[PDB]
Amino acid sequence: ERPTFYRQELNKTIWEVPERYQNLSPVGSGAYGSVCAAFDTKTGLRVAVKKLSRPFQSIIHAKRTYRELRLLKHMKHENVIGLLDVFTPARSLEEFNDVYLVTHLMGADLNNIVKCQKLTDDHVQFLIYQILRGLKYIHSADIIHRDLKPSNLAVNEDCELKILDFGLARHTDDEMTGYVATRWYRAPEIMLNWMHYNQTVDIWSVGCIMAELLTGRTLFPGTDHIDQLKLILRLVGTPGAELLKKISSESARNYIQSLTQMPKMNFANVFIGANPLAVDLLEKMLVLDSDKRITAAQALAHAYFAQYHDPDDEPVADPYDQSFESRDLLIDEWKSLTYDEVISFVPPPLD
Numbered sequence: 622e623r624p625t626f627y628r629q630e631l632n633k634t635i636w637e638v639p640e641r642y643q644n645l646s647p648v649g650s651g652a653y654g655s656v657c658a659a660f661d662t663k664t665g666l667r668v669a670v671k672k673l674s675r676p677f678q679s680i681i682h683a684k685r686t687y688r689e690l691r692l693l694k695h696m697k698h699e700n701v702i703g704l705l706d707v708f709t710p711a712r713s714l715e716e717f718n719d720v721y722l723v724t725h726l727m728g729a730d731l732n733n734i735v736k737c738q739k740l741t742d743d744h745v746q747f748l749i750y751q752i753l754r755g756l757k758y759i760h761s762a763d764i765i766h767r768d769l770k771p772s773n774l775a776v777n778e779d780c781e782l783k784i785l786d787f788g789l790a791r792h793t794d795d796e797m798t799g800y801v802a803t804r805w806y807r808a809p810e811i812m813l814n815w816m817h818y819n820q821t822v823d824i825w826s827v828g829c830i831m832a833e834l835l836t837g838r839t840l841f842p843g844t845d846h847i848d849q850l851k852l853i854l855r856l857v858g859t860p861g862a863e864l865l866k867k868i869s870s871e872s873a874r875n876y877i878q879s880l881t882q883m884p885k886m887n888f889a890n891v892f893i894g895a896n897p898l899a900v901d902l903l904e905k906m907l908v909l910d911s912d913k914r915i916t917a918a919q920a921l922a923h924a925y926f927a928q929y930h931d932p933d934d935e936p937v938a939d940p941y942d943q944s945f946e947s948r949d950l951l952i953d954e955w956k957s958l959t960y961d962e963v964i965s966f967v968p969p970p971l972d
């Protein structure tokens with residue numbers, strides 16, 4: 622049943638992993654967790670192993686660890702990060718304090734691709750198709766990613782794409798401040814807290830990404846929140862009375878009304894030389910009123926993706942029980958719940 626584990630110190634941290642994982646080599650960084658690349662001798666796959674930093678330190682961390690594991694165990698889709706394995710060296714709940722998570726090793730993110738390679742319209746078609754395909758899956762389980770940007774999209778040498786790094790923790794105010802890529806892909810309602818957000822925030826992010834694939838350049842590289850809002854409103858226009866009413870914040874609504882009114886720009890004169898179907902799709906995604914944006918399912922049927930669209934191979938997710946989110950528990954209760962999820966994990970099959 623239980624595998625044999627071996628110990629190894631790598632960069633001032635003790636990795637204790639099953640024997641199946643060999644040639645552990647440190648990768649990236651770790652405020653969320655330390656990450657090693659390894660070779661999985663059971664599957665034959667190169668894998669990334671994450672050891673969680675201080676998982677049951679507070680109630681908020683313990684719940685976040687449970688949330689991450691619940692979410693990762695659910696995701697079973699080609700275009701979304703899947704769990705290969707989850708383990709602990711603990712033999713009981715009483716000595717449980719470390720969680721390790723295993724997934725397929727990724728080399729390149731979409732940021733590396735747009736920076737370093739020239740992309741044809743067919744590449745943009747295929748890349749955006751795959752993001753939307755994964756988003757249809759994610760959104761069908763009532764999961765909102767909340768933080769789609771090129772650095773959270775893993776891409777291989779065949780242009781095959783996966784969505785990673787879900788909005789699990791809140792960002793700090795400081796990492797959202799200034800001339801930063803962490804805010805450039807955020808929908809303005811979430812960036813400025815206009816109203817209760819919903820899954821359509823992710824479609825805004827896809828439009829920003831699509832635009833950057835087409836031009837090679839950030840669409841809204843604001844130097845701060847307000848500079849970024851001005852860049853957004855220059856392109857899409859200032860809001861009308863209908864959207865203004867939906868902005869629940871009185872001060873945010875007051876500030877918007879201080880701005881000089883601007884019409885929506887001609888997107889064919891911004892996205893010069895782009896496929897007219899790409900421009901049409903962008904106009905449907907980069908809509909200020911979140912209720913009027915195209916959804917992922919709607920966008921997959923758009924003519925831009927006619928080469929790739931297959932309605933029989935665009936699956937939806939199994940129902941995801943998210944009722945834990947409204948629940949208030951103790952640390953040892955979240956920890957016990959987390960332990961049950963580690964021990965009940967079944968690896969995905971062979972093909």
Ligand SMILES: c1ccc2c(CCc3ccncc3)c[nH]c2c1
Nearest residue numbers: 669670671722723724725726727
């Ligand atoms: C689940 C979520 C995240 C991770 C990580 C860190 C992110 C990553 C993913 C793939 N390759 C390299 C780095 C490693 N393993 C994980 C398991």
